Design a protein around this motif. Structure first.
Motif, short mmCIF file in Angstrom:
data_model
loop_
_atom_site.label_atom_id
_atom_site.label_comp_id
_atom_site.label_asym_id
_atom_site.label_seq_id
_atom_site.Cartn_x
_atom_site.Cartn_y
_atom_site.Cartn_z
N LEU A 89 0.83 -1.21 0.00
CA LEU A 89 0.00 0.00 0.00
C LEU A 89 0.86 1.24 0.00
O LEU A 89 1.90 1.32 0.66
CB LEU A 89 -0.95 -0.03 1.18
N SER A 90 0.37 2.22 -0.72
CA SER A 90 0.97 3.55 -0.83
C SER A 90 2.32 3.52 -1.56
O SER A 90 2.92 4.63 -1.69
CB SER A 90 1.07 4.31 0.48
N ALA A 91 2.73 2.41 -2.13
CA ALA A 91 3.97 2.33 -2.93
C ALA A 91 3.67 2.79 -4.35
O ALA A 91 2.56 3.26 -4.70
CB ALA A 91 4.58 0.91 -2.87
N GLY A 92 4.70 2.72 -5.19
CA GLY A 92 4.52 3.09 -6.61
C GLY A 92 4.10 4.53 -6.72
O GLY A 92 4.66 5.39 -6.06
N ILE A 93 3.09 4.79 -7.56
CA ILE A 93 2.66 6.18 -7.86
C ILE A 93 1.98 6.83 -6.66
O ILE A 93 1.73 8.06 -6.74
CB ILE A 93 1.77 6.24 -9.10
N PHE A 94 1.72 6.12 -5.54
CA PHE A 94 1.21 6.79 -4.33
C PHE A 94 2.34 7.43 -3.54
O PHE A 94 2.04 8.13 -2.57
CB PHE A 94 0.42 5.82 -3.44
N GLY A 95 3.60 7.20 -3.88
CA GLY A 95 4.69 8.09 -3.41
C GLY A 95 5.31 7.72 -2.09
O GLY A 95 6.26 8.45 -1.67
#
Length: 167
Positions: A125-131
């Motif tokens: 969760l919150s990885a990749g394009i969520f920064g």
């Protein structure tokens, strides 16, 4: 015993693999696949765009009807919808998006949704394009989720870094 294959065991309950969550869902047909959703269930990019594309946009059609009836999710919240051709169910979970300025403390609340399901296939969760920092996301996952979670990490480089740095 379950169907998940090739995972490294990190803890009693958390497993990890370098894999495309779309291809993994298609192979396993898990009871629950987790989507990296936003509050509007607009599945444009990242994990959500890839999952939705694999459903031929049926995930987006179902999601638009959910929002029309219920309004947006909360950051840190979730809803259960169909898994279409990928899984029995999709748990749409909203982690905080650092690129929108959301409170990273909400990441623990996001992962608490996983505890309502005995077994899940999930992204960080919150990885990749969520920064967010994926190393942090994995630590919160291990320290929050008590049910059995199979994490798919798309990027091989990141996978190797998550394993090597895991305490």
């Amino acid at each position: 015993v379950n169907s998940f294959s090739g995972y490294l065991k990190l803890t009693d309950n958390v497993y990890i693999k370098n894999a495309d969550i779309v291809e993994e869902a298609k192979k396993v047909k898990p009871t629950v696949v987790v989507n990296a959703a936003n509050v509007y269930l607009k599945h444009g990019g990242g994990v959500a765009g890839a999952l939705n594309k694999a459903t031929n946009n049926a995930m987006q059609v179902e999601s638009d009807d959910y929002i029309a009836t219920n309004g947006p999710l909360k950051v840190g919240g979730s809803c259960v919808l169909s898994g279409h051709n990928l899984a029995k169910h999709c748990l749409h979970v909203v982690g905080p998006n650092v690129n929108k300025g959301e409170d990273i403390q909400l990441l623990k609340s996001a992962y608490e949704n996983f505890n309502q399901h005995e077994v899940l296939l999930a992204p960080l969760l919150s990885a990749g394009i969520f920064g967010a920092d994926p190393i942090h996301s994995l630590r919160v996952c291990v320290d929050t989720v008590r049910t059995n979670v199979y994490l798919a990490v798309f990027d091989k480089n990141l996978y190797d870094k998550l394993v090597s740095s895991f305490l």
